[PDB]
Design a protein around this ligand. Structure first.
Ligand SMILES: Cc1cc2nc3c(=O)[nH]c(=O)nc-3n(C[C@H](O)[C@H](O)[C@H](O)COP(=O)(O)OP(=O)(O)OC[C@H]3O[C@@H](n4cnc5c(N)ncnc54)[C@H](O)[C@@H]3O)c2cc1C
Ligand SMILES: CCCCCCCCCCCCCCCCCC(=O)O
Ligand SMILES: CCCCCCCCCCCCCCCCC
Length: 573
């Protein structure tokens, strides 16, 4: 109806992080008709713009409200896995931390044309940094805004840094500088523009919405890719969607000749939509009567997510009032005047903060790269599940109660060995996917050992004189949790997502039978169909996954518009 009579050079499934970048670069020269289909609404919420409002976005109408299958290995629990549902996608709901990981993460992919040397210029092209000038590892004119966080806890941030030095960890002045080792303590940069969320809707899509060759539909739920098995190969025709929920008319958007469908529905929904389109393991598609168009074992396999647990500790009575919770709320749960004024006057203070933007990468046992990320928060968790405690914090407003002053250290397995999957529970494309994070399932128990040693690392730091000054005991996991078996059980009962999720449409070399896309991001066995989102990441880098997604989308845009090739090798003689 809004597409009837139209032919598109690109149809982007989803309007999230990658889709905003592609919509921008693919529509730039004016010759190509680009359509964006996003299930969620327009990006207008004040809770998106204010970083501390991340607390309100969890479990909100701007989230998918996805829950895993029951996890036997995690005390028989379903795990909440937050996912953005609006233009900008998860970039509009994330903790804004800016991480590329280490050079070793990209070289470990072992995919021709996607080495660390290959991807570095695509990170740099995307970047404008308020705190790092141009050089080997930083750019200065790209659409992303990156900056040092504009909130500092004067007592607790320096106490965390002094405590990390007292236990012998070295500082890392730039977690994105590949000329030195990834390990150390320091400050995480953030995807913010003077304390306002700089999501990819704001940085890439919103500025170009006036382009006549660019059509963006919201409230548009894609139900499948339309694929024709005519000539002698499967050919994408376009995509089916509803603008009116499960009961809506199935509309079809149509490709112009030479048109491509680009999957941008992210590491949960892209493999889900591919399976609904006939692209996936034939046995899974046959289960729900889906005709097999491309029998691809890898679709929805290799789900990688970075699992988290935490410690938390109150400050002494004499240090009541010094936590970020005291800077945001007064003793009655009223938003502080000073915080509102500092945010609105010059984009500073507690409302600029996502909480978890100082920390460390740590090797728990002589690994080639750090297995542990630490996120220090100068406020005290009231739940061992950090995401639950952020939801509690949002609901705390105006309750007339005092949030107790303290600290938290979240421990993340940042290069996990466990994998999970995404598949189908039902034939209905409006139904939640069958979601299995796979936390703590690796054969050697490596991921559990990382989180157990992380808790020992956080306890060592909290015991150090620098942080001991402020603290008065431990709330989580608490004095009942001491032996390795007690810690392991605390972890199983409290483990939560640090909200990565990659690898479900794994990019791979020729000869890699687990791959879903080639090094050109084309889906095996279909013409005019690509995946450009976190799905394609072969092996998850250390640290949060947003910046790698934007890099992949920048490089894919350059490839599709003929400004770059991928691979590399001279022809053999
Ligand atoms: C709570 C949270 C915290 C995070 N913290 C950080 C962090 O601090 N730093 C960071 O770098 N990364 C962070 N991440 C991860 C990062 O945000 C993601 O890896 C990245 O945004 C993924 O980009 P994407 O384009 O692959 O998918 P997304 O941005 O998730 O976009 C996919 C889009 O597809 C849409 N879609 C789904 N199904 C359909 C359908 N049927 N029809 C149409 N559209 C559909 C979705 O609604 C969504 O808008 C966080 C993630 C979350 C959720
Ligand atoms: C943890 C609780 C998060 C609280 C966040 C909401 C705080 C709102 C303060 C009052 C509104 C501030 C003025 C509106 C600013 C709009 C956002 C922006 O345009 O950058
Ligand atoms: C955005 C600032 C909110 C202040 C929160 C005060 C409590 C601190 C809790 C930290 C929770 C564990 C680690 C972070 C979880 C990230 C979702």
């Amino acid at each position: 109806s809004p597409v009837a009579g139209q032919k598109y050079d690109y149809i982007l499934v989803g309007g999230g992080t990658a889709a905003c970048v592609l919509a921008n670069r693919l529509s730039a020269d004016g010759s190509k008709r680009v359509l964006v289909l996003e299930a969620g609404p327009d990006n207008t919420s004040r809770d998106v713009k204010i970083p501390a409002a991340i607390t309100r976005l969890f479990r909100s109408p701007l989230d998918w409200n996805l829950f895993s299958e029951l996890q036997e290995q995690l005390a028989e629990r379903q795990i909440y896995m937050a996912r953005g549902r609006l233009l900008g996608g998860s970039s509009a709901t994330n903790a804004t931390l800016y991480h590329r990981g280490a050079a070793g993460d990209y070289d470990a992919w072992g995919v021709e044309g996607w080495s660390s040397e290959d991807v570095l210029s695509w990170f740099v092209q995307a970047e404008t940094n308020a705190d790092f000038g141009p050089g080997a590892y930083h750019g200065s004119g790209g659409p992303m805004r990156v900056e040092n966080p504009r909130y500092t806890n004067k007592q607790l941030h320096t106490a965390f840094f002094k405590a990390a030095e007292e236990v012998g960890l070295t500082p890392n002045s730039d977690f994105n500088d590949w000329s030195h080792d990834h390990a150390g303590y320091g400050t995480f940069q953030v995807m913010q523009d003077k304390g306002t969320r700089a999501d990819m809707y704001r940085q890439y899509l919103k500025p170009v919405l006036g382009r006549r060759n660019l059509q963006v539909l919201t409230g548009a739920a894609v139900t499948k890719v339309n694929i024709d098995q005519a000539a002698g190969k499967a050919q994408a025709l376009g995509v089916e969607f509803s603008t009116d929920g499960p009961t809506g008319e199935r509309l079809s958007a149509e490709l112009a000749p030479g048109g491509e469908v680009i999957m941008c529905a992210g590491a949960v929904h892209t493999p889900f939509l591919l399976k609904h389109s006939g692209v996936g393991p034939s046995a899974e598609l046959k289960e729900f009567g889906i005709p097999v168009v491309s029998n691809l074992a890898g679709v929805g396999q290799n789900l990688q997510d970075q699992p988290a647990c935490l410690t938390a500790a109150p400050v002494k009575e004499k240090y009541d009032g010094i936590a970020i919770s005291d800077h945001i709320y007064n003793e009655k749960g009223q938003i502080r005047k000073r915080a509102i004024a500092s945010y609105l006057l010059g984009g500073r203070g507690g409302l600029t903060s996502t909480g978890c933007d100082r920390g460390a990468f740590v090797r728990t046992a002589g690994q080639a790269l750090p297995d542990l990320q630490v996120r220090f928060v100068p406020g005290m968790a009231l739940d061992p599940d950090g995401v639950s405690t952020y939801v509690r914090f949002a609901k705390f407003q105006s309750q007339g109660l005092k949030w107790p002053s303290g600290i938290t250290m979240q421990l993340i397995a940042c290069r996990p060995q466990s994998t999970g999957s995404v598949g189908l529970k039902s034939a209905d494309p409006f139904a939640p996917p069958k979601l299995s994070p796979g936390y703590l399932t690796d054969k050697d128990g490596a991921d559990l050992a990382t989180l157990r040693k992380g808790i020992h690392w956080a306890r060592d730091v909290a015991r150090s004189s620098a942080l001991s000054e402020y603290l008065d005991g431990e709330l989580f996991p608490g004095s009942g949790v001491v032996s390795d078996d007690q810690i392991d059980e605390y972890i199983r009962r409290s483990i939560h997502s640090s909200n990565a999720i990659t690898g479900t449409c794994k990019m791979g070399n020729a000869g890699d039978s687990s791959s879903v896309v080639d090094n050109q991001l084309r889906v095996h066995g279909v013409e005019g169909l690509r995946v450009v989102d976190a799905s394609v990441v072969p092996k998850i880098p250390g640290g949060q996954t947003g910046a790698p997604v934007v890099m992949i989308a920048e490089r894919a845009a350059a490839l599709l518009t003929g400004k770059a090739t991928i691979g590399a090798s001279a022809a053999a003689p």
